Ligand SMILES: *C/C=C(C)/C=C/C=C(C)/C=C/C1=C(C)CCCC1(C)C
Ligand SMILES: *C/C=C(C)/C=C/C=C(C)/C=C/C1=C(C)CCCC1(C)C
Ligand SMILES: *C/C=C(C)/C=C/C=C(C)/C=C/C1=C(C)CCCC1(C)C
Ligand SMILES: CCCCCCCC/C=C\CCCCCCCC(=O)O
Ligand SMILES: CCCCCCCC/C=C\CCCCCCCC(=O)O
Ligand SMILES: CCCCCCCC/C=C\CCCCCCCC(=O)O
Ligand SMILES: CCCCCCCC/C=C\CCCCCCCC(=O)O
Ligand SMILES: CCCCCCCC/C=C\CCCCCCCC(=O)O
Ligand SMILES: CCCCCCCC/C=C\CCCCCCCC(=O)O
Ligand SMILES: CCCCCCCC/C=C\CCCCCCCC(=O)O
Ligand SMILES: CCCCCCCC/C=C\CCCCCCCC(=O)O
Ligand SMILES: CCCCCCCC/C=C\CCCCCCCC(=O)O
């Protein structure tokens with residue numbers, strides 16, 4: 001059921017926050033503190049999202065089906081910080097950071113329009129949103145990776161792992177979307193929630209740990 | 220269905236035992252043999268639990284719902300050995316081992332009372348059981364980790380990984396419990412079984428492999 | 439539902455192909471190119487299988503139930519290449535390769551007979567197919583591992599990980615089979631599809647990445 005996964009999401013994000021929080025406090029140096037604090041806020045942001053959705057907020061019937069528009073409101077806040085874990089670890093220049101944040105903001109807004117518009121029109125917006133996402137794939141796969149590998153020549157494998165896991169996790173969101181009642185409707189509303197919840201826990205708590213392990217590798 | 224996951228649990232634990240068994244035999248030295256044998260017994264204990272539950276044993280209708288009280292009977296036997304993988308790898312002193320086993324035994328007995336008592340009374344016992352679990356979180360996170368890191372100074376990352384994975388896996392059990400009909404009832408009896416089965420395979424077969432990889436790291 | 443997982447399978451294998459394809463192109467040397475190309479074809483083969491099954495092809499009612507015989511047609515093509523990732527990485531001699539491919543081909547054909555025959559007769563074929571699989575377990579666990587470890591003495595852990603993950607993943611297929619309506623019928627046709635799809639994505643996309651990480655370890 002929808003409620004079950006929304007409550008699993010609340011506790012998992014809340015417990016993720018406690019761990020990153022206890023890590024933020026008791027951090028060795030400033031570099032460790034910033035990384036734990038970024039991840040603490042990401043999980044606090046997702047905890048709030050799931051708490052509102054679990055309590056039945058941020059949902060309205062759009063085009064016949066119940067739609068959690070609040071997901072886009074918070075993804076607009078957490079995804080930029082999730083991209084900052086990468087640029088912070090990589091020590092990426094401000095212009096590339098701006099490009100990434102720019103493309104990320106374009107993808108979510110057009111992605112939001114695809115969710116609230118009736119079909120076939122929504123497919124146009126889904127396509128626009130995917131092109132913005134493919135602009136991010138390129139930025140991380142090419143200029144981000146190159147700059148990060150030239151800055152950390154003994155740790156090329158750490159950035160390949162960061163980027164690849166990021167690519168695998170972020171690609172499943174438009175897939176879930178196109179297979180849900182928003183697209184082809186191959187599965188219900190209940191499966192869509194389970195999928196987004198598993199994806200969110202993985203992209204926030206999971207990537208959270210991966211970014212800390214990456215910093216231990218970099219030393 | 221309940222039966223499906225109970226039979227997946229039997230085979231997974233049985234197959235886990237065969238692998239640790241074949242490892243116990245053909246072990247290089249005594250240190251490797253003890254680790255494979257600990258894990259062999261853990262999985263043999265879980266195989267028996269799932270075989271009894273799959274055959275419909277160790278279940279009675281308590282407070283209107285069917286309750287697998289046999290889970291606590293075997294968790295009382297396997298969880299102490301799962302804590303011994305940690306103290307064995309870490310080379311932890313007997314007093315700390317006793318403290319861990321003590322808190323672990325207190326958590327399961329009060330945890331068992333929470334399962335057999337009617338609500339609201341059961342919430343008191345759930346809270347007592349959680350405090351005992353938080354005493355274990357502390358012991359592993361602080362004196363266990365410190366002693367293990369001072370004994371293995373080149374392998375601090377191995378113990379951070381052992382402890383963190385242990386913390387993530389063991390925390391999901393009270394979550395599953397509070398969301399099941401024992402607590403808030405956000406999901407059925409069929410989902411509770413699937414969850415405990417996935418958790419058990421992960422905590423026994425999965426942690427089993429993680430503890431062997433940790434020993435290879437320590438050399 | 440059956441269709442949902444079949445479409446998740448199509449996209450996941452298609453996306454796996456794009457990644458290995460983009461890797462095949464842009465590969466440093468010949469060794470990297472062969473590995474990415476092997477994995478590119480494996481995923482292209484699975485993409486085709488799922489596309490046919492998703493479009494309702496390669497299925498007929500055998501012994502009362504709908505049976506996807508096309509799974510065995512493609513497993514006959516992809517599993518030999520999945521074994522070649524191992525022999526290619528390990529630098530295994532042609533005779534052992536032939537033995538592995540031989541036992542693999544025997545397992546699938548008898549495995550195919552078990553699927554199309556009525557029960558109890560099908561159990562005989564399931565048993566024959568399992569013995570052929572246990573001949574593969576032995577070959578990878580013993581002569582393959584020994585030869586690969588003597589060729590790569592600083593990378594014994596890489597081959598233990600390749601072999602173990604292969605052993606864990608390939609063992610779940612006969613388990614899924616014996617628990618489905620083909621055997622004991624502990625779960626429906628819809629769960630069987632979900633299970634094979636999760637197993638296939640893991641054994642092809644997942645093992646795909648694991649074999650690339652193994653090559654980075656070997657250098
Ligand atoms: C913590 C939340 C995360 C990491 C979610 C990120 C969401 C996306 C990458 C979604 C992208 C979408 C498309 C590429 C096209 C339209 C549909 C979207 C919005 C799901
Ligand atoms: C192999 C089995 C394992 C690792 C299970 C461990 C079980 C727990 C850590 C359960 C703890 C519980 C609470 C902290 C409060 C009450 C409910 C329990 C018993 C599920
Ligand atoms: C990419 C597809 C993969 C890796 C599938 C491999 C399938 C097997 C190892 C199945 C083996 C079977 C038995 C050992 C006995 C009869 C049933 C089978 C065919 C499922
Ligand atoms: C630097 C990038 C900042 C992101 C800004 C992106 C703006 C995208 C432009 C147009 C999207 C369409 C505006 C939304 C109208 C939706 C109407 C509706 O709610 O039905
Ligand atoms: C019964 C309805 C029929 C269902 C047909 C579903 C067809 C699925 C095919 C293609 C999915 C669209 C491709 C996904 C976009 C790739 C994500 C990205 O842009 O990175
Ligand atoms: C230190 C490196 C370790 C990182 C390796 C782990 C990589 C695993 C990545 C992705 C697989 C996880 C996918 C599970 C998320 C749920 C997806 C869904 O339900 O749609
Ligand atoms: C060293 C720690 C050993 C663990 C001993 C813990 C004992 C806990 C004390 C009291 C728990 C309550 C006793 C169980 C009564 C349950 C009655 C019932 O079954 O309904
Ligand atoms: C429809 C019924 C409403 C459901 C409300 C569910 C509320 C869930 C909120 C909190 C869960 C309890 C917190 C879990 C305990 C933390 C585990 C631990 O002690 O380590
Ligand atoms: C060598 C280090 C490798 C260890 C890293 C792996 C860490 C992954 C840990 C936890 C995620 C797995 C959670 C899946 C268990 C099922 C949970 C459930 O269904 O409730
Ligand atoms: C080198 C190994 C090559 C693999 C060849 C294996 C051949 C196995 C032998 C006999 C299997 C039975 C033949 C299939 C008859 C099925 C009849 C039917 O479809 O109902
Ligand atoms: C209601 C019907 C009863 C269901 C009983 C199911 C019994 C399950 C017992 C054993 C499963 C068969 C063993 C699996 C084969 C091992 C795989 C291998 O050969 O490697
Ligand atoms: C670089 C080494 C990393 C490899 C370690 C990961 C090992 C995990 C292996 C197996 C667990 C995954 C099982 C999930 C597949 C789905 C199974 C099913 O649904 O039947």
Ligand SMILES: [Cl-]
Pocket residue numbers: 045046049074075078079
């Ligand atoms: Cl969020």
Ligand SMILES: [Cl-]
Pocket residue numbers: 151152153154155218
């Ligand atoms: Cl470096």
Ligand SMILES: [Cl-]
Pocket residue numbers: 264265268293294297298
């Ligand atoms: Cl147990």
Ligand SMILES: [Cl-]
Pocket residue numbers: 370371372373374437
């Ligand atoms: Cl050390």
Ligand SMILES: [Cl-]
Pocket residue numbers: 483484487512513516517
């Ligand atoms: Cl295939």
Ligand SMILES: [Cl-]
Pocket residue numbers: 589590591592593656
């Ligand atoms: Cl080597």
